[PDB]
C-alpha cells in the first residue's frame, strides 16, 4: 500500500503577479536601488517547456508604474515656474538665421519677478515656436491654460541608466532563451535568473532606440498580427546607426525669480542658427527594411506587396520620433524613412526641439527642460520599430504599414518579453511506501 509523504522544497511554481525591486550599478536608477552583485547566475532548466505571454506580463505594468513614480519624484525638489505664465512680447530672430529654421526661434521679453516682491525686472529669453501660442505680437506659453509647470533641476541628468528588476524571495524570474520566440506560447528553453538584464529606460516613439538586438533574425511580435488595433514590435537583428545633433552653439543664463529660486533660460545662439537635423545610415536602413519585409511576408504571404508610409496623424509625440538627446527633447520627422513599396549616403531627418514637455500623455503636469549650453551630439543604435497596419483594405494583395506607438509600455515589452515572474510553492505531497 502507498502512503502520503510530505515534501518541502519541491521545484514547483505557478504564474503570479508580485512586486519586483530595482537593482543598479539621475532621474532613473537613484540611490534607492540596491547594488547589483557583479556575478549573475543563470540556472538553465533542462527538459522544461514553459508558456509565456509578453502581452499580459504584469512586470511591464510594474516597470511603467516605477518609471512614472521616479519621474514624478525627481520633479518634486525643484523650482516650479508658476510666475513664468506672463504676457510675452516676442519678435522673430533674424541674426544669421538660416532658411530652414524660419520663424522657429522667437526672442521674447517679459516682466519677470525678482528676489524682492516689490520690484520687477525686464528680461528676455528665446523660445521655440512650438512653446508659444498667440493670445489676441503677444504670446504665452502653451501650458498656461492646461497645466502647472515644474522646471527640471539643472543637476539631474536625463541619461538612461540600466536597471535590473529582481524578484523577492519566494519568487523566481524565468527567462526564455529561444531564438525564434515570438512573444506568446510554449518556450522549450527556459532558465531561471535572479534578475533581469540591464534595461535602459529609454523614452521614445516611432522608432526604438538603444536596447537588446535579436540573436538570429528580425522578429515580428504582435498580440494578433491580423488585428489592426494592436501594435507590432519589430526587433532588429542588426542595429541601424543614427546620429542626431543640435548644431547650434547655445548658452544658458540664470534669471533669479525669487528667494533662492532661479529660471534657466536661453540667451543667444553664438553663430548661425541651423536646423537640428539627424542622420540615419541609408544602406543599413534599406537592408533592414528588406529584412523586415522578408519577415512580414511569413505572416501576410509571399505574394503581398508591402508598403511603408508615414504616420496618419495625431499629437507631435506620435507623428514624429520623440527622444531625449543630451537633455533636449527632439521630435524628428521620420517621413523620409517610411516611404517605400516592396514588390514580391545617409538619410537626413529634420527635427524640432521642445522645451515645454507634457510627458506620458498626462494633463495637468508639464515640465520645462532647461536649455543645454554647447552643441549636442548623440550617436545611438536603432534596435526596433513600432508599426501599425492600415485596415479596411480594398486592394487585397497589398498591405500598408505605418509607424505608431506613444504608449510607452509597448517600448518596455520589447525588453521584458523574455521574462516571466512565478511564485514558488515548495510544499507538496506524493505517495511513497513509507509509514510514520
Amino acid at each position, epitope marked *: 500500500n502507498l502512503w502520503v509523504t510530505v515534501y518541502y522544497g519541491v521545484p514547483v511554481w505557478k504564474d503570479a503577479e508580485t512586486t519586483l525591486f530595482c537593482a543598479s550599478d539621475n532621474v532613473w536608477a537613484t540611490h534607492a536601488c540596491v547594488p547589483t552583485d557583479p556575478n549573475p547566475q543563470e540556472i538553465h532548466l533542462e527538459n522544461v517547456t514553459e508558456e509565456f505571454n509578453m502581452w499580459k506580463n504584469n512586470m511591464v505594468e510594474q516597470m511603467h508604474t516605477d518609471i512614472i513614480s521616479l519621474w514624478d519624484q525627481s520633479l518634486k525638489p525643484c523650482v516650479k515656474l508658476t510666475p513664468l505664465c506672463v504676457t510675452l512680447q516676442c519678435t522673430n530672430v533674424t541674426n544669421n538665421i538660416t532658411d530652414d529654421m524660419r520663424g522657429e526661434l522667437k526672442n521674447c521679453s517679459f516682466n519677470m519677478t525678482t528676489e524682492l516682491r516689490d520690484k520687477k525686472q525686464k528680461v528676455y529669453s528665446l523660445f521655440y515656436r512650438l512653446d508659444v501660442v498667440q493670445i489676441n505680437k503677444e504670446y504665452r506659453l502653451i501650458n498656461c491654460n*492646461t497645466s502647472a509647470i515644474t522646471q527640471a533641476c539643472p543637476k539631474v541628468s536625463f541619461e538612461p541608466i540600466p536597471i535590473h528588476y529582481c524578484a523577492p524571495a519566494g519568487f523566481a524570474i524565468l527567462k526564455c532563451k529561444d531564438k525564434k520566440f515570438n512573444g506568446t506560447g510554449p518556450c522549450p528553453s527556459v532558465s531561471t535568473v535572479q534578475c533581469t538584464h540591464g534595461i535602459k529606460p529609454v523614452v521614445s516613439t516611432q522608432l526604438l532606440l538603444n536596447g537588446s538586438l535579436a540573436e538570429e533574425e528580425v522578429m515580428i511580435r504582435s*498580440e*494578433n498580427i*491580423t*488585428n*489592426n*488595433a*494592436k501594435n507590432i514590435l519589430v526587433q532588429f537583428n542588426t542595429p541601424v546607426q543614427i546620429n542626431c545633433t543640435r548644431p547650434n552653439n547655445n548658452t544658458r543664463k540664470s534669471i533669479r525669480i525669487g528667494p533662492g529660486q532661479a529660471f534657466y533660460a536661453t540667451g543667444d545662439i553664438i553663430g548661425d542658427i541651423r536646423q537640428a537635423h539627424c542622420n540615419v545610415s541609408k544602406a543599413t536602413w534599406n537592408e533592414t527594411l528588406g529584412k523586415v519585409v522578408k519577415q512580414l511576408r511569413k505572416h501576410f504571404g509571399n505574394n503581398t506587396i508591402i508598403r511603408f508610409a508615414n*504616420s*496618419s*496623424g*495625431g*499629437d507631435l*509625440e*506620435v507623428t514624429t520620433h520623440s527622444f531625449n538627446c543630451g537633455g533636449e527633447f527632439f521630435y524628428c520627422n521620420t517621413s523620409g524613412l517610411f516611404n517605400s513599396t516592396w514588390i514580391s549616403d545617409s538619410i537626413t531627418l529634420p527635427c524640432r526641439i521642445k522645451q515645454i514637455i507634457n510627458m506620458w*500623455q498626462r*494633463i495637468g503636469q508639464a515640465m520645462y527642460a532647461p536649455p543645454i549650453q554647447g552643441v549636442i551630439r548623440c550617436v545611438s543604435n536603432i534596435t526596433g520599430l513600432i508599426l*501599425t497596419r*492600415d*485596415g*479596411g*483594405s*480594398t*486592394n487585397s494583395t497589398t498591405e*500598408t504599414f505605418r509607424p*505608431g*506607438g*506613444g*504608449d510607452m509600455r509597448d517600448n518596455w515589452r520589447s525588453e521584458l518579453y523574455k521574462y516571466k515572474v512565478v511564485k514558488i510553492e515548495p510544499l507538496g505531497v506524493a505517495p511513497t511506501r513509507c509509514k510514520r
Partner: antibody
Amino acid sequence: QVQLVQSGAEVKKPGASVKVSCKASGYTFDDYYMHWVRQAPGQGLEWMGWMNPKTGGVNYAQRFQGRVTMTRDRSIDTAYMELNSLRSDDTAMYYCARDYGGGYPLDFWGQGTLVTVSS
Amino acid sequence: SALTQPASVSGSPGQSITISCIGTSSDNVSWYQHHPGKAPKLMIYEVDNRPSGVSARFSGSKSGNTASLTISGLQAEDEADYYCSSYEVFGTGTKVTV
C-alpha cells in the same frame, strides 16, 4: 451608465467639409479607442477608422485615406471626425463606437448623425 | 475578407431560425443588431460570449469556417438587421422579417 452623444443632422453641398462631434460620458475617455463607422444610404455598415485618444493616434480605412481627419479634445472628452471634399456617395448615417478594451469589439455605439450631400 | 450572410430569413415565433456568417476566420467573431431609427448594439462579444444585460435567447457558435447566431425563439420584439463581423469587415445584413 456610459453614454455617447453626437451632434445633430447636417446637410452639406459637394466640396464642403463636415466635422462630426462625439461627446463621451460615464467612463475614462483616454483609455478606450473610438471607432467611426458608416451606415451608407441603405447598405450595410462600413468601417472607416479608429482613433486612440491617449496619444491621438489614428488608423484610417484605405478607401478614405487623405479625406478624413480624426482628432479629439481631451478636456471635455469629445472626439471629432472631419470629412473633406464631400461627394454624393458620402450621404449616410455616421456613428461613433467605443472599443471593448483593445481589439475590434465596438460595444457602446452612440446615437448617430445623418450627413446629407445634395445640390 | 468578404463575409457573406443570408439576405432574408423568415418565420414566426418559436421557429428558432439561425443566421450564418459564411467566410469568417477563426476566433473573435462578433454579432450586432441594428434597429432602424436607433443605433446598433453588440449581441455577441466573441464567437458565443454575450454582454451582461442581454437576453439569453441569443447564442453564438462556430462551425470551423462558418459562424452562426441561434435565436431560441423569434419573439415579436426581436426584428432587425443582424451583422456579423471579424475585425472591421461587415456582412451584407440579414433582414430578419417575422
